[PDB]
Amino acid sequence: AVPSVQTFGKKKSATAVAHVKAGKGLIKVNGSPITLVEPEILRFKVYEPLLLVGLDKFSNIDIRVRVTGGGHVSQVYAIRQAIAKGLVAYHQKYVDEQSKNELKKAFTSYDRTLLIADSRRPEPKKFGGKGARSRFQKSYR
Amino acid sequence: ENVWFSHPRRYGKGSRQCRVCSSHTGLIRKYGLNICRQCFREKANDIGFNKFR
């Protein structure tokens, strides 16, 4: 009966399922801490929500994220969305509603795309074209 | 007479043909129907294939 919440960050083709528990505040992605995300530029992007919420409130919550599908950017964005929504779910279950509202307000002020899913999935291919909506040529002579 | 088909007809488009017009071009071997494309267009509604998109 220990605390456990299961959330999911979604992208165009990337799904990252997040198990949120009450632990020591260590975040694991693909069985490893996200500090080795690799590009060293996306680490700051991942930390921006954690930076704005502060390490004080995320002291005793541990998240294990398993990602699959999509690309690097898709997976990392899905990871951020999953950790954000798992954080809000943890706040709904246990933490103060005022704290949840303040974190939601800060997140919306910074970037509305952090929690809300990026559901602008691409248009399909079309006949008589190489790309989505591009034609070859109306050759005359 | 064994001299009429000395050249092999075991494989290739000579044998991979449709059962309607016996043609060897515009054939589809997908799902093992081995039918010409236009005859498939004609009979797809009764076969089961339907136009959706």
């Binding site: - | 799902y31 093992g32 129907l33 009979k43 509604n45 009764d46 076969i47 294939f49």
Partner: protein, 167 residues
């Protein structure tokens, strides 16, 4: 022995084969349609038509040799194919039956306009909402032409779809 992916297409091809053979060899006798039923060690095929007795023939020799036809064609077990005949209800509501009747009338040789009037009055007496016939080709002319006769309104959408459009 076959994956279901090829097996479904094979079953569709067999159904198309039976329908095409029956309509080609039974055009003179007024064929309308075929339905199938599969059960263990037996396959029943039922022909929906109008002249059930005439397609039966004398002592059912027609249906016996048609069963033997389908048998030797599709290489099933001997004697496991059985066909029956049923009189279609609402006979005039199928375009195939109307087309066969108009073919019969053309073979008889009455006027095209008289036949059009007759099929219109017959379809309205049957109760169909509307109809549309098109005669395309040469008819006492050096070059071809297309003439359409329509009764009621006929939609042109797939909202009614094959469910309501009969071609």
């Amino acid at each position: 022995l076959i994956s279901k992916k090829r097996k479904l297409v094979a079953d569709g091809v067999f159904y198309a084969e039976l329908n095409e053979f029956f309509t080609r060899e039974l055009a003179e006798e007024g064929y309308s349609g075929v339905e199938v039923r599969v059960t263990p060690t037996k396959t029943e095929v039922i022909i929906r038509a109008t002249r059930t007795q005439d397609v039966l023939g004398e002592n059912g020799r027609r249906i016996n040799e048609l069963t033997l036809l389908v048998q030797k064609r599709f290489k099933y077990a001997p004697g496991t194919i059985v066909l029956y005949a049923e009189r279609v209800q609402d006979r005039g509501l199928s375009a195939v039956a109307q087309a066969e009747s108009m073919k019969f009338k053309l073979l008889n040789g009455l006027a095209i306009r008289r036949a059009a009037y007759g099929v219109v009055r017959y379809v309205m007496e049957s109760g169909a909402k509307g109809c549309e016939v098109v005669v395309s080709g040469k008819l006492r002319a050096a070059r071809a032409k297309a003439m359409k006769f329509a009764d009621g309104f006929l939609i042109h959408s797939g909202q009614p779809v094959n469910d309501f459009i009969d071609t």
